[PDB]
Amino acid sequence: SMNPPPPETSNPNKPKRQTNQLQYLLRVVLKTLWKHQFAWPFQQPVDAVKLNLPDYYKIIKTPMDMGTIKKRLENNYYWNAQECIQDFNTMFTNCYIYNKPGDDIVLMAEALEKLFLQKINELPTEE
Numbered sequence: 159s160m161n162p163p164p165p166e167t168s169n170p171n172k173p174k175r176q177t178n179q180l181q182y183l184l185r186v187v188l189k190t191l192w193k194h195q196f197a198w199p200f201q202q203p204v205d206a207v208k209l210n211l212p213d214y215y216k217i218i219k220t221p222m223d224m225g226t227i228k229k230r231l232e233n234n235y236y237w238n239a240q241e242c243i244q245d246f247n248t249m250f251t252n253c254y255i256y257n258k259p260g261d262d263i264v265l266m267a268e269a270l271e272k273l274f275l276q277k278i279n280e281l282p283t284e285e
């Protein structure tokens with residue numbers, strides 16, 4: 159297949175915590191972006207086979223998507239909020255690497271990223 163194995167959503171050896179910040183990332187940030195009208199391309203790994211993107215995984219070596227992030231949050235996969243924020247950042251910046259200006263996906267990513275940043279600016283202080 160053109161598609162690599164998807165990023166893991168669990169691993170017994172991953173060190174894991176629950177924090178109020180991670181809870182906010184699931185209950186507010188992910189939830190808000192998941193229900194957005196532009197979420198749909200980002201709700202699962204890029205399927206380069208079905209979508210006829212034979213160079214996608216030639217260019218993008220650290221893929222990420224919100225389906226993966228959602229499952230990671232549900233599985234308490236993260237050690238801290240920063241690890242989760244980094245996955246969102248990877249998701250957005252992969253688009254800015256792969257796509258060109260004006261592409262549908264890049265305009266959608268930009269809108270979701272603006273909203274992400276607005277929600278992350280209200281991340282609670284860790285208790």
Ligand SMILES: COc1cc(Nc2nccc(Nc3ccc4c(C)n[nH]c4c3)n2)cc(OC)c1OC
Nearest residue numbers: 198199200203204205209211214253256257262263
């Ligand atoms: C095709 O490019 C990406 C698709 C996706 N993801 C995705 N998931 C399900 C359906 C779907 N259809 C779909 C979207 C857009 C288009 C354009 C334009 N032409 N045909 C298209 C079909 N797409 C994610 C991506 O990056 C995160 C992409 O950009 C590399």
Ligand SMILES: [Cl-]
Nearest residue numbers: 203221222223
């Ligand atoms: Cl992915």
